[PDB]
Design a protein around this ligand. Structure first.
Ligand code: HEM
Length: 471
């Protein structure tokens, strides 16, 4: 490994073959920050046997993300992750064909069906669980709270319900079944990073295999076939799998993968958002105020969804601070990469290209002043309208907040995710009293091993209590 003309700064580290494998794995954001300081906005580093070209200039992300698979490929790493984490291997298929197919079942008239179904499931699960436990305060971790209700409602919306004439007894069974899905799923979720790195102990391995075994049985095509009000998202996905001749037991494996892909972010996102509001009285008052004016003018007032500018900014800001996915490409053929300021750089076939929006634009102090601070109105202009104008190096940024990925490898459920988070926040702030146990609790650190998977998770939960509001 010697630099060719036109290639980025190259930094091999101290340890042979491994390189910066340890530093990157332990805390990728801290490590990559140091490397930005050392090398500027593009560098090639060696980590665990691979040469990773890191691009940290947000102005130059568009020259990379829209590139064809025959030049820059995202699918090889997804494929690898499917197998190593979820034990799914599927017949070769087109990712761009399937993403197009899937995204349609998550948009327009289907989204409207999902959005309506989501609100009644969120309501049924949240108010169902509170009514069962009774009218007093209930103590809970805020993550456990946010993740539980969103995943359980999300699961019931996408995977269907016990019954559709809709009874007291079917709704009660869905609360219990969905709680089982949540509690089992969470055991796998917690160990995802170790799964991906193959660092499970003998016991961890046995625990993971038993958890998978249960999840694969819960979400078997046979069990799902009896469920009512299944989503077009699900039904068309099942058909796609059948088309490829995938057996029912591998269908179940793929459905558990989809369970993670569709539910593994909303819960954690809402946790951080609610925590930031609980810690910032002026921010919470402005959110309450906006939702209350609409409430004063079981369906959801459409204005909560499409006319909540303060809430939109709160969600954008929350995600700015806590969404840390990797945008990752395999360099398929030797190529030239244009930077927005005139420069170009040579990418070598076999290298891995990594963009990390979390670091820039999201926590870039030249873009956002005090980027470490939650400022609820950061995405609002003084008149309360959505702020869309952000700058770096004397130029207006097209990409300034990128929690949903970019290019053709971006979130297929984004509108549904935003709508769902807003419905949950609305339900919590309007029906419930919600309180930190200790109002001076500090915001926990992330589990720093999770960088790159999507929404960050806290290294420990935050104790809260809630109740159905009494009068
Ligand atoms: C705040 C919540 C969410 C965030 C920040 C988020 C973010 C992302 C990101 C960054 C990706 C790119 C994949 C990657 O990182 O390599 C992605 C893909 C995807 N998203 Fe989301 N997501 C969220 C919620 C959801 C929801 C609610 C759904 C649908 C119910 C969904 C459906 C999908 C699917 C299906 C894919 C990949 C397609 C596949 O492999 O089948 N996401 N998401």
């Amino acid at each position: 490994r010697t630099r060719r003309p036109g290639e980025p700064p190259l930094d091999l580290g101290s340890i042979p073959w491994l390189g910066y494998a340890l530093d990157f794995g332990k805390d990728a954001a801290s490590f990559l920050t140091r490397m930005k300081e050392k090398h500027g906005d593009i560098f090639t580093i060696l980590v665990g046997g691979r040469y990773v070209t890191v691009l940290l200039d947000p102005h130059s992300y568009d020259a990379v993300v829209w590139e064809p698979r025959t030049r820059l490929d995202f699918h090889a790493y997804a494929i690898f992750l499917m197998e190593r984490i979820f034990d799914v291997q599927l017949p070769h298929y087109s990712p761009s064909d399937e993403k197009a197919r899937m995204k349609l079942t998550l948009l327009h008239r289907e989204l409207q069906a999902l959005t309506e179904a989501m609100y009644t499931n969120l309501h049924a699960v949240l108010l169902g669980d509170a009514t069962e436990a009774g009218s007093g305060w209930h103590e809970m971790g805020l993550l456990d709270f946010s993740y539980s209700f969103l995943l359980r409602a999300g699961y019931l919306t996408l995977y269907g319900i016990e019954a559709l004439p809709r009874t007291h007894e079917s709704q009660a069974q869905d609360r219990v079944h969905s709680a089982d899905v949540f509690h089992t799923f969470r055991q796998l979720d917690r160990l995802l990073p170790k799964l991906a790195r193959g660092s499970l102990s003998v016991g961890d391995k046995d625990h993971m295999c038993s958890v998978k075994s249960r999840l694969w049985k819960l979400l078997s095509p046979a069990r799902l076939a009896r469920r009512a009000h299944r989503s077009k998202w699900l039904e068309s996905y099942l058909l796609h799998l059948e088309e490829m001749g995938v057996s029912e037991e591998m269908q179940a494996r793929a459905l558990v993968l989809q369970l993670w892909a569709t539910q593994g972010n909303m819960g954690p996102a809402a946790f951080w958002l609610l925590l930031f509001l609980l810690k910032n009285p002026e921010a919470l008052a402005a959110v309450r105020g906006e939702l209350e004016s609409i409430l004063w003018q079981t369906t959801l007032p459409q204005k909560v969804l499409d006319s909540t500018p303060v809430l939109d900014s709160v969600l954008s800001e929350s995600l700015r601070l806590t969404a840390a996915p990797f945008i990752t490409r395999e360099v398929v053929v030797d190529l030239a990469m244009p930077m927005a300021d005139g420069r170009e750089f040579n990418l070598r076939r076999g290298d891995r290209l990594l963009l990390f929006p979390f670091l820039s634009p999201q926590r870039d102090p030249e873009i956002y002043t005090d980027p470490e601070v939650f400022k609820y109105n950061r995405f609002l202009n003084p008149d309360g309208s959505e702020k869309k104008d952000f700058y770096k190096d004397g130029k207006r940024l097209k990409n300034y907040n990128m929690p949903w990925g970019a290019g053709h490898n971006h979130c297929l459920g984004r509108s549904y995710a935003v709508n769902s988070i807003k419905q949950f926040v609305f339900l919590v702030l309007v029906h419930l009293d919600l309180e930190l146990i200790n109002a001076d609790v500090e915001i926990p650190e992330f589990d720093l091993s999770r960088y790159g998977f999507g929404l960050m998770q806290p290294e420990h939960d935050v104790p809260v209590r809630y109740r159905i509001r009494p009068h």
